Design a protein around this ligand. Structure first.
Ligand SMILES: CN[C@@H]1C[C@H]2O[C@@](C)([C@@H]1OC)n1c3ccccc3c3c4c(c5c6cc(O)ccc6n2c5c31)C(=O)N=C4
Length: 293
């Protein structure tokens, strides 16, 4: 009940109004969970990212609560940090750190990453996934739009509006919640998928860093799902241009047989990640992508 739900949120958030705590608001995006702004913390002077949402006009209240609770209790260096939340009337505020570097999508569509830079991004994403999966959380919507970058080359994952919390008693889900082009086949072909669906999505992001877009991008979402489920493991345009160790990494992420697909813990040991350049190597790409954005 919107009532029992509102009390739940009331217990979760900090008391009072945020309006006096932050200044210089600047819209930077929007989603089904609200509008996101860049703002200045009056006290600390830290620039943050604030999402404002009107509860009255919000379908799944349960999901927003779950999103906040998951972020609060699963802090990690590779996950955009959740700072606080407030509730003023029907206006819910969620405050988190701001990554000024933009998204990975901007980088892959505007620049050309080399393998050493790709291995670094993949490593950081895998660190977030290994952490989440070992903490019983499947993100379920891994894609370049949800990977943000710091001006120093930091790589962090965000938007837990679709994550799932599992347990040994119930280690699998069946809800279709991800984004078509990054969805693993089993999410379609059958019911009951596990944490490895995030590994598949990571593999698609790797293709993105290589080719600039995920497979079937020019195709209709409804169609893409069919193709993914029927063709399975995507085909690379110019496989011969990639190193043997990167090609092997890709095959382990995009394997059809879930059991055969590498897990996060396993892939963190993969030798492709060892050719990673320092994250500072991403700063030139971020600058270029940002200017073009
Ligand atoms: C890529 N698509 C969109 C980009 C934009 O708005 C969306 C709605 C969405 O990002 C997932 N969006 C969110 C949606 C749900 C939760 C957190 C966020 C969120 C967060 C940040 C940014 C951000 C930073 C930036 O420098 C440019 C654009 C940015 N966008 C951010 C964020 C951030 O720094 N910390 C959290």
């Amino acid at each position: 009940s919107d009532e029992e739900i509102l009390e739940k949120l009331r217990s979760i958030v900090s008391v009072g109004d945020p309006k006096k705590k932050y200044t210089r608001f600047e819209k930077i995006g929007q989603g089904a969970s609200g509008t996101v702004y860049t703002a200045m913390d009056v006290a600390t002077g830290q620039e943050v990212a604030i999402r404002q949402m009107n509860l009255q006009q919000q379908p799944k209240k349960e999901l927003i609560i779950n999103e906040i609770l998951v972020m609060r209790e699963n802090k990690n260096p590779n996950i955009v940090n959740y700072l606080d939340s407030y509730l003023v009337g029907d206006e819910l505020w969620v405050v988190m750190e701001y990554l000024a570097g933009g998204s990975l999508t901007d980088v892959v569509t505007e620049t050309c990453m080399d393998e050493g830079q790709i291995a670094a991004v993949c490593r950081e994403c895998l660190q977030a996934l290994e952490f989440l999966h070992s903490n019983q959380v499947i993100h379920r919507d891994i894609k370049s739009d949800n990977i943000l970058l710091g001006m120093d080359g930091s790589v962090k994952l965000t938007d837990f509006g679709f994550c799932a919390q599992i347990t040994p008693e119930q280690s699998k889900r069946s809800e279709m919640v991800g984004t078509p082009y990054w969805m693993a086949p089993e999410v379609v072909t059958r019911k009951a998928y596990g944490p490895k669906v995030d590994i598949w999505s990571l593999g698609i992001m790797a293709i993105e860093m290589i080719e600039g877009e995920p497979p079937y991008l020019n195709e209709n979402p409804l169609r893409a799902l069919y193709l993914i489920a029927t063709n399975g493991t995507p085909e690379l345009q110019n496989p011969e241009k990639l190193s043997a160790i990167f090609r092997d990494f890709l095959n382990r992420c995009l394997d059809m047989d879930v059991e055969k697909r590498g897990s996060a813990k396993e892939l963190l040991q993969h030798q492709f990640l060892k050719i990673a350049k320092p994250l500072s190597s991403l700063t030139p790409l971020i600058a270029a992508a940002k200017e073009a954005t």
